[PDB]
Amino acid sequence: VQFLRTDDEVVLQCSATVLKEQLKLCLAAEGFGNRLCFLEPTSNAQNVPPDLAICCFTLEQSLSVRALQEMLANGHRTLLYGHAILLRHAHSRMYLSCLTTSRSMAFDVGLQEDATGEACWWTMHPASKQRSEGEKVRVGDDLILVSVSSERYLHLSTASGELQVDASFMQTLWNMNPICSCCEEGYVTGGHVLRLFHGDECLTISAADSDDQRRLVYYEGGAVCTHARSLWRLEPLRISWSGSHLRWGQPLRIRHVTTGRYLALTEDQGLVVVDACKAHTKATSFCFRVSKEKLDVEGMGPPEIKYGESLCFVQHVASGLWLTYAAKKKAILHQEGHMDDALFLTRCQQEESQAARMMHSTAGLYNQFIKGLDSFSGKPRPPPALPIEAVILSLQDLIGYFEPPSEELQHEEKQSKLRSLRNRQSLFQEEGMLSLVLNCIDRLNVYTTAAHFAEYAGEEAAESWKEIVNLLYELLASLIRG
């Protein structure tokens, strides 16, 4: 594609010079637990895969000044310079916006729950005389993005040492690189969260707190087919057009969603799942093959692999080894494999997909909090700063996430919303969310009062002690409620 249309998935990219070299950074936010945007390095993708899932936005709308201002009193259209755009985060379903807070004493840029104000609208402007107002925005174009609410530039900040995003009066050139646009119905694209079925049996890692360390891969049947631990994100070795149609033989990384780890071949362990910082191309590159015989684009490309209907052998690219079972059976990489090695893929729906990523971030955050709690116990203090603010917001968000529907609503909708809530509760429960909440409750209850906590933690950290235990108990209730 040459032009950006509405309903396209894009990433906002900028550049920085770090140690005499260009570093490409994408705009990222988690949403839940943390609204603030940050920058995800994408340059070192060959060695360390970037956390791309939270970098994706969709172009919801592109309005003229008159259309925007007029609609504020209350299909795939091309982007034109001078248009105001609405960017919806794919994961959190929140909207990229200019926030009313600041970290510098400029404005913070983050995610907003609702696209209701001026704050979630951004006008696009030409970076040179090569483009003009009312002209189509082209793929590859450098853009200036102006906050409609504050009249400020989407800015890359370099103070101090760290690379950050804010809304500043200084300008920054941005590229809206397309991830995907207009997919063929029923076809596998990159960035899709899915399950790999065998023959029923699906590919997975073990349950939380297993003696596995959650690092081995298995073919497992029964209930695991509906649990988060069997979900994987397909990640092509590219950033632009990463959401393009997946092709036979095309190399890709296979990411485990709840754990954030990468299917890999290792020298000593063989087929395992590996940390991002050890997920280099050779160890971590796989492709789908039509058969076991010998054997780039700037668009969606040709649609090749169908959901459910396509049978795919998985092959490790660098080694040529086939994804197979040892003979719940363990997954291995073998020179020959087995005649029934072919897998079919099934797309994960967004409720489950979102839940799985939510658990990933929740686990990461609460384990960080637990590790900080363990570090100063019992070491009376100058106290390894605790993520208080994020823990609070994470808790508050998860509580609203698990909130039962209002009894005032009708019967038909009530039963439908209940069925979703239970399913959401189930996914978290099966991923060891209860233990996680309990471990925070238990480690905090080691202290009698806030002042007792203040003896080991910060006096300032203690100001939130009661609120956190209260919220943790509240979440516990919300997780258990039927």
Technique behind the model: X-ray
Asked if 32 and 177 sit in the same domain, the reply is yes
* Domain stop point among 322, 348, 374: 348
- 8 in Cβ contact with 137 (< 8 Å): no
Asked if 313 and 432 sit in the same domain, the reply is no
Nearest Cα neighbor of 96 from 77, 117, 123, 119 is 119
Asked if 387 and 472 sit in the same domain, the reply is yes
| Resolution number, Å | 2.5
Asked if 152 and 195 sit in the same domain, the reply is no
Asked if 206 and 343 sit in the same domain, the reply is yes
**Phi then psi dihedrals of residue 3, to 5 deg:** -115, 150
CATH code of the domain in which 154 resides: 2.80.10.50
What is the extent of the structural domain holding 453? 349-482
Q: CA 177, CA 68: separation in Å to the nearest integer?
A: 24
Q: CA 139, CA 412: separation in Å to the nearest integer?
A: 46
Asked if 7 and 151 sit in the same domain, the reply is yes
Asked if 23 and 116 sit in the same domain, the reply is yes
CATH code of the domain in which 440 resides: 1.25.10.30
The amino acid occupying position 417 is: K
Nearest-10 Cα torsion for 422, 427, 430, 436: -100
Q: Which residue has the tokens 């400020």?
A: 152
Asked if 366 and 298 sit in the same domain, the reply is no
What is the distance of C-alpha 105 from the center of its chain?
30
98 CB contacts (<8 Å, ≥6 apart)? 107, 109, 119, 120, 147, 149, 150, 152, 167
Q: How many residues comprise the chain?
A: 482
Asked if 245 and 169 sit in the same domain, the reply is no
Asked if 271 and 306 sit in the same domain, the reply is yes
Q: Which residue has the tokens 């092709």?
A: 247
Nearest Cα neighbor of 394 from 422, 433, 427 is 433
Q: CA 367, CA 365: separation in Å to the nearest integer?
A: 6
* Domain stop point among 181, 203, 227: 181
- 156 in Cβ contact with 140 (< 8 Å): no
179 CB contacts (<8 Å, ≥6 apart)? 8, 9, 10, 11, 56, 191, 240, 241, 242, 243
Secondary structure, 3-state, the chain: CCECECCCEEEEEEEEEECCEEEEEEEECCCCCCCECEEEECCCCCCCCCCHHHCCEEEEEEECHHHHHHHCCCCCCECECCCEEEEEECCCCCEEEECCCCCCCCEEEEEECCCCCCCCEEEEEECCCCCCCCCECECCCEEEEEECCCCCEEEEECCCCCCEEEEECCCCCEEEEEEECCCCCCECECCCEEEEEECCEEEEECCCCCCCCCCCEEEECHHHHHCHHHCEEEEECCCCCCCCECCCCCCEEEEECCCCCEEEEECCCEEEEECHHHCCHHHHCEEEECCCCCCCCCCCCCCCCECCCCCEEEEECCCCCEEEECCCEEEEEECCCCCCCCEEEEECCHHHHHHHHHHHHHHHHHHHHHHHHHHCCCCCCCCCCCCHHHHHHHHHHHHHHCCCCCCCCCHHHHHHHHHHHHHHHHHHHHCCHHHHHHHHHHHHHCCCCHHHHCCCCCCCHHHHHHHHHHHHHHHHHHHHCC
Locate 48 and state its tokens.
């360390």
